[PDB]
Amino acid sequence: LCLTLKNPIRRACISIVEWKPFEIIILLTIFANCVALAIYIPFPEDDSNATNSNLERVEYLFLIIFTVEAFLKVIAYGNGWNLLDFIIVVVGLFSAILEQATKDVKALRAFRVLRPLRLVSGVPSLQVVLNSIIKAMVPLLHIALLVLFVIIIYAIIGLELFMGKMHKTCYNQEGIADVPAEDDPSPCALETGHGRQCQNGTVCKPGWDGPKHGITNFDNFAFAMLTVFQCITMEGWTDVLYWVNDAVGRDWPWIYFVTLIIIGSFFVLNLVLGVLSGEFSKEREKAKARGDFQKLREKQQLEEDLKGYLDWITQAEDIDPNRFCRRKCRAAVKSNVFYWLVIFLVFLNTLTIASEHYNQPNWLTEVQDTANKALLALFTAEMLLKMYSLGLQAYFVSLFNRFDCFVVCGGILETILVESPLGISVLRCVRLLRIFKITRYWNSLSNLVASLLNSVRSIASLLLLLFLFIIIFSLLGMQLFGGKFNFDEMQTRRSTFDNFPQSLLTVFQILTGEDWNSVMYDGIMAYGGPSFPGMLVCIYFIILFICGNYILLNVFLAIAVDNLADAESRFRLQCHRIVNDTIFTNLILFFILLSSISLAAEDPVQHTSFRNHILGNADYVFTSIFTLEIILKMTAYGFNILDLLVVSVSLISFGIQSSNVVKILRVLRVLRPLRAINRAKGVVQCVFVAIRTIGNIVIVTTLLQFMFACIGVQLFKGKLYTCSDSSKQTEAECKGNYITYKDGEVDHPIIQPRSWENSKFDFDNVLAAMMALFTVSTPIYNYRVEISIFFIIYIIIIAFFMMNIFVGFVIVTFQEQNQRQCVEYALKARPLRRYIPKNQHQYKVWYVVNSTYFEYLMFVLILLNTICLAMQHYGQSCLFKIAMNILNMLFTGLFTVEMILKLIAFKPKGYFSDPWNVFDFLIVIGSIIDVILSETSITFFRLFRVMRLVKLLSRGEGIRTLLWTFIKSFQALPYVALLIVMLFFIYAVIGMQVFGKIALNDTTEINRNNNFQTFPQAVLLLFRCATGEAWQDIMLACMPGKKCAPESETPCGSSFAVFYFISFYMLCAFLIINLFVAVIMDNFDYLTRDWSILGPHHLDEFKRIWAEYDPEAKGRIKHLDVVTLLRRIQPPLGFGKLCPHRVACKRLVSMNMPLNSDGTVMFNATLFALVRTALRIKTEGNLEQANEELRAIIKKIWKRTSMKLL
Ligand SMILES: COCC(CCO[C@H]1CC[C@@]2(C)C(=CC[C@H]3[C@@H]4C[C@@H]5O[C@]6(CC[C@@H](C)CO6)[C@@H](C)[C@@H]5[C@@]4(C)CC[C@@H]32)C1)COC
Ligand SMILES: COc1cc(Br)c(C[N+]2(CCOCC[C@@H]3CC[C@@H]4C[C@H]3C4(C)C)CCOCC2)cc1OC
Ligand SMILES: [Ca+2]
């Protein structure tokens, strides 16, 4: 609200003078402070260098410039973004002057990290990106109102069952001390609770603050909400589960987590993608509206024009003939002789480069040098000759040719240099150009590189914003937690806000979630213990994992949806009788249905306890059953390739007579039902096509990992070798023994032996680098920091194109996959009634129960109950528990009132005729039974209460619709769901049979809580791997050499492991992306709709208004509609304030009405007429055009007695 106090002059006319010069110096000051907050090293205690104090000095210049600017601009006016300036200044000068005499800014001076926001504010280049980002999150606020609901429901349920049970721990050795359990202490359970039982001479006893310093316990509510949150982010969900499993037994803890994950992450994860993608498409559409794609095609056609007449200017000297040389080189460049030859020289040169390996003899070193020397001469002559034939200009024009020239110059440079080793290696890394000069598989290579340039160029500004955000947080990190990480442990923390470099690293790790929850603890245990004010440090490590990851996802998607696409665009008779009748069909479906359970249910540990034992006979019998499947065999043999798999499984089943591997090779039975579902008809080739696409994509990554690492060899060879004794720095020096003090105990000398060892990720040869590169997918700073960044790029590049080729590849799936729908909701739609009270008493209550207020009150009471179950700590004064129980009684009683009232405002059937009403009924009865039991399992009848909260979700249209929609599409994902369960099942039986008897050792990863001995536990282990939870280690635990279990009676743990787990991870990821894509695509109408124009949801309102003015199940409205016709019409539909008594009536009578009586016209007439006015318009004569159009097209000519219009 501009004051417009235009007091003549000298108000403004100061910053008005030299706008651009004065604006810039402020921006330069901002950039100087962004580089001033990144020096001050934050320190232990109060020590300071000269610079720090000297930067506090220049903060007294940045706090005289920002104040004169502020006041001079105030004089002008005295809005939004400028508020940031004002608050930063206020807090600033303040803080200082306050502290001026004080000589604990921290917080008070941890605000200046908000100054780099003025970098966004001033520069308008990314300010638009910030509005786009902000304006894209507006739709997905319903999803932020639901992630919160799931968390709350889960936290509440959780504190109720598992709170306070995690406090024991094997606490001794029948002597006197502390948790002995190695280190890892894990809730233990007394000899009566079926939890872990403690062994040896250990004893369980109360104490142990917690599972993990007390911050991973459902004790108390806040710890509970936070635990659930850390838990849904799939960052150690298995661990919380194991601690809980240890404390309360293993039977029911798991259901609660599997759900939390499936309903919390997979389901919730999809919505954000669906909401975000729909938004991108809207933007993509606006962009298409621009016509840019067509313009880009015209630019490429211009490019081929300059080439196609570049050959013409080349020929221009043919009539001007020196000339001979020109003609020769022209033929050459065209002559394949040059092409194939040069391609060959590439690979061979490529070879030379890879040849380099540590400890290389001259046999190699000599050869490499000799080759390069000549190979380099080769490329030169060729490029040089290609210069003349081609048009110098156009030759330099083609990006690739230009890069070629650049790198040949690199060779010249390195040669004249030889006339540091690192620099030479770098130049040779540059020479990997030719390596890809051949443009192998350019079909993709070219597109990916071209796209890569386009893609990277496209998201420049978004990347800028990401970087600004990261820098801001890192500065806050060093200010907030910097210096507070001295926990007095020689333990080396990779994550520490000691300095900005590390600060950035910590932030990135948190963003990547490598150990982000762990980093939380550092701060939340730094500033203070796991107490009250010591947790307001966590409110930070989240704001970074949601916001950062949000921006990160926004930036990615863009790559995809917004580029890839733009870029990519007698006896036999009777036999049939029986074998066609249900019996020899739906019945057989059963004979395998439960037969499949045979492999699913088996004892794969103990030898032949009846259990395992007898199960052989059933196999035998199902197999005689498959012989019977021979009576059906020649019935009509030579959809039967399925029948050959029946033949094979049947034969190996009879082959079970005396055989092992074959036995375990019987899981094909499960797949005998999968065919039946695709047989629900509705492609095999498409599947094959998808598989081919996937394989192809594997190869791109593979070759990249090759070239990237051939870079590593040249750069890191021989710089990881080291000795155990840090003092020694030469292989020769490292010979003998040294002394190590356990945990830095001066009184704990340990005579270890010195050894010269190469570190992990040994780039000693292309090969090891190769596998390490896989290892990242599957010292501290000696030279590590550098390697670090190398181990971040393979990533970027990898994803960058693994996605590019794939998601863009997919869309064809979408190719395969409003006015009409609105017509069909106007036609083929019937009006509804509403229960009216037939009795006076039945009525008063009705008015009330339906009185809006009553609903208002109900919700208030609901909030209160949950605010009464939330407060349940670990140690609550008994008075308090009594209070809580009495309160629950009051609440249950109040809900009884409503149930009974409603049943007296709506007849029994009416109340019960509504799902929500029945839900309420159930909650109430169960809650009352709980009350009874208490006044007197029990716990189950208690959780109930909490659930009610859900009914608060059956409210806002925004949230109601989204869920309903996706739920209304979580059935059209069958084929990508049966497929997934099939996977789990098969892999599990297989697994339980090979990696099964591996003995269980709590110290390893095949512990009693993640074993492979009962179908259920194996499916849980596979779900962990799928959820990407350290699947790796489980895998290592399944390699040969593990001892066989005692009941099994080291011949165990077959090597197949790698194939299994890796194959599993891969297949799972795919099937899952297929799931998400399937869902969203199928529901891609809601995910993108111009709510402005008319849709169905904008149309149902008419029924709820019409029935409001309509007694029974009726139609045939009275003429007194003259009021309601526009009484309450959504302005998108009709008018909103315009005089109702306008032509509105004359026009509604203007079109002909159906030849009915005075009051025998349906609601369909008014509805469809309003829709028509709301949609495409037509004139007279077109009356019949419209009529025939309706009864020829919209659901074809669905016969309708639509007499006259509408
Ligand atoms: C009705 O049909 C309309 C259809 C609309 C076109 O749909 C586009 C919308 C984006 C969409 C659905 C498309 C392709 C792959 C989809 C992606 C797979 C990736 O998977 C993820 C999962 C999570 C990430 C870790 C990796 O990538 C998502 C980010 C990514 C994803 C789900 C984002 C959405 C993408 C194309 C056109 O029809 C011809
Ligand atoms: C109703 O008819 C149907 C229509 C469609 Br579309 C589908 C879905 N399908 C299956 C989706 O994935 C099939 C491709 C493969 C299935 C196995 C995994 C992941 C991927 C496969 C590559 C490894 C049918 C096959 O091609 C199109 C996609 C199933 C139907 O049921 C037969
Ligand atoms: Ca992880």
Swiss-Prot record:
A motif (Selectivity filter of repeat IV) lies at residues 1027-1030. Keywords: Autism, Autism spectrum disorder, Brugada syndrome, Calcium, Calcium channel, Calcium transport, Calmodulin-binding, Cell membrane, Cell projection, Disease variant, Disulfide bond, Epilepsy, Glycoprotein, Host-virus interaction, Intellectual disability, Ion channel, Ion transport, Long QT syndrome, Membrane, Metal-binding, Phosphoprotein, Postsynaptic cell membrane, Repeat, Synapse, Transmembrane, Transmembrane helix, Transport, Voltage-gated channel. Ca(2+) binds at residues 235, 514. Changing residue 235 to K: Loss of selectivity for divalent over monovalent cations. One of its GO terms (cellular component) is membrane. Changing residue 811 to T: In TS and LQT8; likely pathogenic; gain-of-function shift to a more negative potential in the voltage-dependence of activation, leading to an increased window current and increased steady-state current; unchanged voltage-dependence of inactivation and inactivation velocity. Changing residue 784 to H: Found in a patient with autism; uncertain significance. It is found in: Cell membrane; Cell membrane, Sarcolemma; Perikaryon; Postsynaptic density membrane. Glycans are attached at residues 49, 200, 1001. GO terms for biological process: calcium ion import across plasma membrane; calcium ion transmembrane transport; calcium ion transmembrane transport via high voltage-gated calcium channel; calcium ion transport into cytosol; camera-type eye development; cardiac conduction; cardiac muscle cell action potential involved in contraction; cell communication by electrical coupling involved in cardiac conduction. Changing residue 1029 to A: Decreased selectivity for divalent over monovalent cations. It is a multi-pass membrane protein. Residues 40-54, 163-222, 245-252, 356-366, 482-501, 524-533, 602-613, 657-661, 717-766, 875-882, 996-1017, 1037-1056 are extracellular. Disulfide bonds join 170-198, 188-204, 723-734, 1044-1052. The record marks 235, 1029 as: Calcium ion selectivity and permeability. Inhibited by dihydropyridines (DHP), such as isradipine. Inhibited by nifedipine. Channel activity is regulated by Ca(2+) and calmodulin. Binding of STAC1, STAC2 or STAC3 to a region that overlaps with the calmodulin binding site inhibits channel inactivation by Ca(2+) and calmodulin. Binding of calmodulin or CABP1 at the same regulatory sites results in opposite effects on the channel function. Shear stress and pressure increases calcium channel activity. Changing residue 253 to S: In LQT8; uncertain significance; no effect on channel activity. Changing residue 1101 to K: In LQT8; likely pathogenic; gain-of-function shift to a more negative potential in the voltage-dependence of activation; slower channel inactivation and increased steady-state current. Belongs to the calcium channel alpha-1 subunit (TC 1.A.1.11) family. CACNA1C subfamily. This is Voltage-dependent L-type calcium channel subunit alpha-1C. It comes from Homo sapiens (Human). The chain holds residues 105 to 1649 of 2221 of the full protein.
